[PDB]
Amino acid sequence: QXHXXX
Amino acid sequence: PSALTQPPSASGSLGQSVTISCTGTSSDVGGYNYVSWYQQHAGKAPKVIIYEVNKRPSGVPDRFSGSKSGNTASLTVSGLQAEDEADYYCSSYEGSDNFVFGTGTKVTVLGQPKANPTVTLFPPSSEELQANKATLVCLISDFYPGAVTVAWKADGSPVKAGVETTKPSKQSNNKYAASSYLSLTPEQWKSHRSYSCQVTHEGSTVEKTVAPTECS
Amino acid sequence: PSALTQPPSASGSLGQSVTISCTGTSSDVGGYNYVSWYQQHAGKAPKVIIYEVNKRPSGVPDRFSGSKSGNTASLTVSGLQAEDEADYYCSSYEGSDNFVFGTGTKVTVLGQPKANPTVTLFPPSSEELQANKATLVCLISDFYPGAVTVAWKADGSPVKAGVETTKPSKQSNNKYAASSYLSLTPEQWKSHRSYSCQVTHEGSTVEKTVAPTECS
Numbered sequence: 001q002x003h004x005x006x
Numbered sequence: 007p008s009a010l011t012q013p014p015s016a017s018g019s020l021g022q023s024v025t026i027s028c029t030g031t032s033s034d035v036g037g038y039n040y041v042s043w044y045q046q047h048a049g050k051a052p053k054v055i056i057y058e059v060n061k062r063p064s065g066v067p068d069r070f071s072g073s074k075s076g077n078t079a080s081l082t083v084s085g086l087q088a089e090d091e092a093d094y095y096c097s098s099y100e101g102s103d104n105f106v107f108g109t110g111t112k113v114t115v116l117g118q119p120k121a122n123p124t125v126t127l128f129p130p131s132s133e134e135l136q137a138n139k140a141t142l143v144c145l146i147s148d149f150y151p152g153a154v155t156v157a158w159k160a161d162g163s164p165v166k167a168g169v170e171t172t173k174p175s176k177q178s179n180n181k182y183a184a185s186s187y188l189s190l191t192p193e194q195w196k197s198h199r200s201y202s203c204q205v206t207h208e209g210s211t212v213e214k215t216v217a218p219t220e221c222s
Numbered sequence: 223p224s225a226l227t228q229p230p231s232a233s234g235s236l237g238q239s240v241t242i243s244c245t246g247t248s249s250d251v252g253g254y255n256y257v258s259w260y261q262q263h264a265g266k267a268p269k270v271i272i273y274e275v276n277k278r279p280s281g282v283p284d285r286f287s288g289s290k291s292g293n294t295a296s297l298t299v300s301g302l303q304a305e306d307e308a309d310y311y312c313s314s315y316e317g318s319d320n321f322v323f324g325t326g327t328k329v330t331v332l333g334q335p336k337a338n339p340t341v342t343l344f345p346p347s348s349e350e351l352q353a354n355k356a357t358l359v360c361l362i363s364d365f366y367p368g369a370v371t372v373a374w375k376a377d378g379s380p381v382k383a384g385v386e387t388t389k390p391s392k393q394s395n396n397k398y399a400a401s402s403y404l405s406l407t408p409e410q411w412k413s414h415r416s417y418s419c420q421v422t423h424e425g426s427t428v429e430k431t432v433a434p435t436e437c438s
Contacts, residue, residue, distance in 0.1 A: 003058075051323040052323060054321050131345065143359050143401070145357065170363065170394065183386055
């Protein structure tokens with residue numbers, strides 16, 4: 001996850 | 007600090023099930039709602055199965071439930087399949103663009119049956135003899151559990167040397183696969199009656215035998 | 223799935239700058255700028271060390287560099303320290319519900335000299351066809367560093383299923399030994415013109431060819 005930077 | 011706390015090893019029996027615990031803090035696990043779980047196969051690409059507490063992403067067949075209770079997240083593997091034997095990591099955002107991980111959980115299944123290896127002995131490729139070398143390969147495969155030992159022989163009297171033996175790998179049917187191989191010279195392998203490969207697993211010896219008799 | 227391709231291994235001497243790559247396929251490219259790099263040492267969790275293609279988050283040595291162009295993303299370790307030795311992955315927010323990893327790239331601090339692998343293809347033994355089994359082995363011996371990429375072909379067609387690669391095991395000469403296999407029917411065998419075993423070891427690729435013979 002590039003979970004949002006979120 | 008910690009890193010999201012997981013229990014080092016977790017486990018179930020086939021068809022039974024396990025619930026992994028990821029425990030963090032009010033800054034991460036509590037606070038935001040962005041706990042993903044990572045299923046990593048033994049030294050392999052890590053693939054995500056849950057992304058947002060529970061969230062169904064691309065092809066996660068079976069019961070892979072995500073549920074977080076406040077400051078502790080958790081996943082479950084309802085109806086245990088053996089392919090699930092792996093390593094599970096969790097993650098939470100913590101703010102200012104950062105993500106933290108969990109300390110991992112090794113997840114093993116139980117009740118997976120015993121299987122004695124598939125022993126395939128191989129004589130040197132014609133090509134490799136044209137090139138002047140000669141290698142013999144023993145392929146031990148489809149065995150569970152992954153504990154095994156390989157002998158080599160000249161004729162009955164053993165060859166203890168020039169043998170390199172692999173340490174076993176899980177192959178996609180859960181069963182293991184190991185290799186054993188003898189480095190010889192053409193002259194050598196012409197000058198013998200039979201070579202053999204002894205393979206011992208769960209106290210059960212298979213013995214394949216290769217004699218210079220190749221339609222090459 | 224396998225859509226992000228990364229090298230078998232990247233190795234250097236202390237003080238030497240490595241570079242690793244994530245080449246993507248068909249799909250998104252700059253379409254997705256979302257490329258993240260993860261470090262992972264043996265049986266510790268993943269630590270992210272690059273986000274948004276070039277970013278570099280908090281507590282990350284400024285000698286970890288990140289860059290992307292076309293279908294290709296590059297991470298760099300400058301004047302590499304021992305501590306840098308681990309596996310690296312890339313990650314991309316593709317087909318949404320689809321978060322895709324590269325295949326990994328192991329970073330090695332050259333102890334010994336470099337050693338391009340010896341591949342030895344081996345065909346179904348006749349005796350084996352007498353049992354109506356078909357099994358092809360690819361021996362990869364004496365190589366360093368201990369990471370290899372494997373790929374089968376059936377007349378230049380990259381091959382679907384049958385394949386299983388063991389994990390690189392250290393030998394008594396301290397270099398590496400991995401092996402790969404394919405299972406066929408004697409007719410899946412006897413159909414084709416040639417089968418290949420293809421093996422990559424960081425900027426070095428080697429392909430071996432084996433064709434069907436009737437023998438006996």
